[PDB]
């Protein structure tokens, strides 16, 4: 399955999924129709679906337009059944959904919003995390709690290390600044951050990342690290969740 990024807006990533076996094609989080319209016009194919990770306008923007202007079916969470524009299929946690015979796992991943889901294609060793996990950060906790976000991050990190993560936004460079201000002694992070600056210096994406890397560099996945805790006056008595919420608060005000 081909996976084509679609940098909508200023730093949004939508993803066009191509089913090589046939002509099946869908789009993950179409911020707006225009960018998806451009690519499909090129591919020479039409749109069958529209899968949304969460309800925010920057992920459901082009929904109603693409659906009516393609006959595509909108696939997305059941919790946001009335918030996902034009939703045809409301999927639940652990639900399996077939994209042309390609299995998709539907994992609820609350935190950034209540109802957020991530989509894991085991056959492609790929998971679409929307705004739950980015490279070197997690989403802002608009609706969920620090505990809910930690649980959702652990579901994503319970997948194989080779699993590529297609962060929902190009935030990696900024995320690296805050990450290096907390754990400047982890060279895997110093190493990856430099490569991120290079890509961004020539306008290239830093996505997909991978479970392996985020475990080795994302502060929200390394909150028990001693240097990271002391850099944020995180008492030792704090547990996993508690340490994550302290980091999320600082990053927000960094
Ligand atoms: Fe977003
Ligand atoms: Zn969002």
UniProtKB/Swiss-Prot annotation:
Record GO terms (molecular function): hydroxyacylglutathione hydrolase activity; iron ion binding; zinc ion binding
Which domain of life does the UniProt lineage start with? Answer: Eukaryota
Q: Which residues bind Fe cation?
A: 58-59, 131, 169
Q: Which GO terms describe its biological process?
A: methylglyoxal catabolic process to D-lactate via S-lactoyl-glutathione
Q: Which UniProt keywords apply?
A: Hydrolase, Iron, Metal-binding, Mitochondrion, Transit peptide, Zinc
Name its co-factor(s): Fe(3+); Fe(2+); Zn(2+)
Free-text comment on the cofactor: Binds 1 Fe(3+) ion per subunit. Electron spin resonance clearly indicates the presence of Fe(3+).
Output the Gene Ontology cellular-component terms.
mitochondrion
Pathway membership of this protein? Secondary metabolite metabolism; methylglyoxal degradation; (R)-lactate from methylglyoxal: step 2/2
What are the binding positions for Zn(2+) in this chain? 54, 56, 112, 131
EC id: 3.1.2.6
Subunit annotation: Monomer.
Question: What is the role of the protein in this entry?
Answer: Thiolesterase that catalyzes the hydrolysis of S-D-lactoyl-glutathione to form glutathione and D-lactic acid.
- In which family does this protein belong, per the annotation? Belongs to the metallo-beta-lactamase superfamily. Glyoxalase II family.
> What is this protein called in UniProt?
Hydroxyacylglutathione hydrolase 2, mitochondrial
Name the species this protein comes from: Arabidopsis thaliana
């Amino acid at each position: 399955m081909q996976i084509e990024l679609v940098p909508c807006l200023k730093d949004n990533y939508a993803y066009i999924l191509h089913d090589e076996d046939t002509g099946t094609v869908g789009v993950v989080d179409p911020s707006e129709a225009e960018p998806i319209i451009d690519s499909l016009k090129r591919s020479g194919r039409n749109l069958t679906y529209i899968l949304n990770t969460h309800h925010h306008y920057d992920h459901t923007g082009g929904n109603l337009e693409l659906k009516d202007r393609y006959g595509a079916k909108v696939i997305g969470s059941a919790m946001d059944k009335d918030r996902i524009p034009g939703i045809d299929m409301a999927l639940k946690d652990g639900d399996k959904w077939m994209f042309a015979g390609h299995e998709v796992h539907v994992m609820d991943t609350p935190g950034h919003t209540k109802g957020h889901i991530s989509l894991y294609f085991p056959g492609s060793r790929a998971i679409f995390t929307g705004d739950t996990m980015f490279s070197l950060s997690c989403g802002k906790l608009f609706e969920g709690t620090p505990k809910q976000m930690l649980a959702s991050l652990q579901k994503i990190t319970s997948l194989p290390d080779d699993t590529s993560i297609y962060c929902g936004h190009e935030y990696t460079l900024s995320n690296s600044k805050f990450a290096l201000s907390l754990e400047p002694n982890n060279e895997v992070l110093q190493s990856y951050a430099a490569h991120v600056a290079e890509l961004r210096s020539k306008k290239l994406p830093t996505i997909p990342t991978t479970v392996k890397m985020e475990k080795a560099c994302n502060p929200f996945l390394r909150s028990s690290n001693t240097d990271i805790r002391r850099a944020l006056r995180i008492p030792e008595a704090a547990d996993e969740a508690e340490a994550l919420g302290i980091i999320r608060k600082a990053k927000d005000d960094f």
